[PDB]
Amino acid sequence: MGHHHHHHSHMQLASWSDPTEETGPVAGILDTETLEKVSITEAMHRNLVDNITGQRLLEAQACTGGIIDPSTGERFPVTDAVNKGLVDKIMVDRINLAQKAFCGFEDPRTKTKMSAAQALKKGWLYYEAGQRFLEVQYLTGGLIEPDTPGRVPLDEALQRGTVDARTAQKLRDVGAYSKYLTCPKTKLKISYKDALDRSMVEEGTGLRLLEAAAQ
Structure with missing residues (x-):
């Protein structure tokens, strides 16, 4: 049992x-x-990653906007990635919050352009999901929001x-969040940071590839 449906997920006392x-x-x-x-699905299909680990990685890409094809920083919608990408259909609703977190529950009229963090503060999205979405964004740099050219540093x-301070410290405590990523044989229980230390870059625009040895 890994992530949300099964085991512990959101932040806690650790x-x-x-x-x-x-x-x-x-x-x-x-x-x-x-x-x-190879794709997240392809790695899961072979024996490189688990269903949960693949789900979280796809969620992590959704947290960074669209689902990402390794090649040159492609962006596809969560539903679209299922139709012609590398996402399981079963993950559409589960991940749907993540892509909406950037801009999906925004009303097509006033265009308030709300962040995931702002959604949490006013209860637009969902505390448990949004915080997990902020977790991935924080790990890479800051928090991602519409309107802006990209991501804004937590301090900024x-x-x-x-x-607010209450949210920011929660972002500062990444360790509160459950581990997601499984290694073949060495320890298994690792965080994003630990994988990123072993994560090898495809070339330059293919972003990071998660290193695995099957088992």
Whole structure:
């Protein structure tokens, strides 16, 4: 039991330490045995990753906007990625919050352009889901919101007035969140940061590939 449906997921009382340096977006999975850059589904189909681990990685890409094809930073909708991408249909509703978190529950009229963090503060989206979506964004740099050219640093978000101290410290405590990623044989129980240390970049625009040796 891994992530949400099964085991523990959102933040909790565990610990607050171990910064997260040398990070980046993970687009796909790389088998060290063959150095093959393959889709999340393909890695799950073979024996490189679990269903839950693949789900979270796809969710993580959705948290960074669209679902990402390893190649040159492609962006596809969660539903669209299922239709012609590398996402399981069963994950559409589950991940749907993540893509909406950027811009999906925004009314097609007033265009308030709300962040995930702002959605949490006013209860637009969902506390448990949004915080997990903020987790992935924080690990890479800051928090992602519409209107802006990209992502705003947590500290900059504080002065910007889009987040409060209570939220910011929760972003500062990534360790509160459940581990997601499973290694073949070495420890298995690792965080995004630990995988990112072993995550090898496809080339330059193919973003990070998650290193795996099957088992």
